[PDB]
């Protein structure tokens, strides 16, 4: 199936003294592989997946240089944006950046992206064509003009279509044993009685990878959304994911309801019953 590499960056200004708190994380699909935290002792980009430890000193030096350069851009931006938005030096503010590339089943470039937010709101993003920018307001418009004049988009497009894809393919090969493996959900169903007349059925999916999954209920073979509760997919903490969906039913009628599980680790959709 398709694959992605994505980087996420957050800086949070610290008004009273010193530089912003800066945190960078890198993912391939749903697996974190690197981190940098400005509060940590090492002041290096750090491995977070065993397959990235294959990379030598030059990689780690280069990624450290680049991530610190990222941190400094964010520091400058926080000051610029405070000015653009006529804000005081009293408050804490946040910049967030996300960029990366998607590839299809053939591992060829599909999509690239680069977006930026200030205080949790869209500021500026590269359009799908990787040639122009979406600016949310007049502040971002000024940035857009700056970036157009300096041909920023051209440099980013080269990275997103080239380097990003090249290194993603490299990571997928080095981490093949886990990165190219699917873990099918382990499914079961639980029952709870709320009263003499009402029952809760809960359909569980555990230990699955990647995170994308669909869980639905049917009643007598037709989709049932009413009286259901579906939790957000959550990390187990060991690299796999969990999810559940529950339905409230009349006591004695449990037989009418079936849970249906779709996941890339399952060739056929799975069905469960009480």
């Amino acid at each position: 199936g398709s694959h992605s590499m994505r980087y996420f960056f957050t800086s949070v200004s610290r008004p009273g003294r010193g530089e912003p708190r800066f945190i960078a994380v890198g993912y391939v699909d749903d697996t974190q592989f690197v981190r940098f935290d400005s509060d940590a002792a090492s002041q290096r980009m750090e491995p977070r997946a065993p397959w990235i430890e294959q990379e030598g000193p030059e990689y780690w030096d280069g990624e450290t240089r680049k991530v610190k350069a990222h941190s400094q851009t964010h520091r400058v931006d926080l000051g610029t944006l405070r000015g653009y938005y006529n804000q005081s030096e009293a408050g804490s503010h946040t910049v967030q950046r996300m960029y990366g590339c998607d590839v299809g089943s053939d591992w060829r470039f599909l999509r690239g992206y680069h977006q930026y937010a200030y205080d949790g709101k869209d500021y500026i993003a590269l359009k799908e064509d990787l040639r122009s920018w979406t600016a949310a307001d007049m502040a971002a418009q000024t940035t857009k003009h700056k970036w157009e004049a300096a041909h920023v988009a051209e440099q980013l497009r080269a990275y997103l279509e080239g380097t990003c894809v090249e290194w993603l393919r490299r990571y997928l090969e080095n981490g093949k044993e886990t990165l190219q493996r699917t873990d099918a959900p382990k499914t079961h169903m639980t029952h709870h009685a709320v009263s003499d007349h009402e029952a809760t059925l809960r359909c569980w999916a555990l230990s699955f990878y990647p995170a994308e999954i669909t869980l639905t209920w049917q009643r007598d073979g037709e989709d049932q959304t009413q009286d259901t509760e579906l939790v957000e997919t959550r990390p187990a903490g060991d690299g796999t994911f969990q999810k559940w969906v529950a339905v409230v039913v009349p006591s004695g009628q449990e037989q009418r309801y079936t849970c249906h599980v779709q996941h890339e680790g399952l060739p056929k959709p799975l069905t469960l019953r009480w």
């Binding site: 996420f8 957050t10 949070v12 945190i23 994380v25 974190q32 981190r35 935290d37 977070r48 408050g91 804490s92 946040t94 967030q96 996300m98 937010a117 205080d119 949790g120 709101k121 869209d122 639980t190 709870h192 809960r202 555990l206 939790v231 957000e232 959550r234 990390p235 187990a236 903490g237 060991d238 969990q242 559940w244």
Partner: protein
């Protein structure tokens, strides 16, 4: 300022069985800004050895973090997660329900 309140799930890493080592998780998501206080509680008392994931965020820019600790469930011990955030008037406590 945009302000978004955290969603909280408290749960174990592996299927919960008394006497068998496991991990207790508190997953906090959908919040903004990023400053947040998360504690894991054993019988109402704050657990000291708690780790957390590196801060990341979803498409809509909202943050998420996983807090976790090693634990061995017993019949009698009650577990919970306590969350405070600028959006919350009082800390929010969610109890671990192993029966789900």
């Amino acid at each position: 300022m945009i302000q978004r309140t955290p969603k909280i799930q408290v749960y174990s890493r592996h299927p919960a069985e008394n006497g068998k080592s496991n991990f207790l998780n508190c997953y906090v998501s959908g919040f903004h800004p990023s400053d947040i206080e998360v504690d894991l509680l054993k019988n109402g008392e704050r657990i000291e050895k708690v780790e957390h994931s590196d801060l990341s965020f979803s498409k809509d820019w909202s943050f998420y973090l996983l807090y976790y600790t090693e634990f061995t469930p017993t019949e009698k011990d009650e577990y919970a997660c306590r969350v405070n955030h600028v959006t919350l008037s009082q800390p929010k406590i969610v109890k671990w329900d192993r029966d789900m």
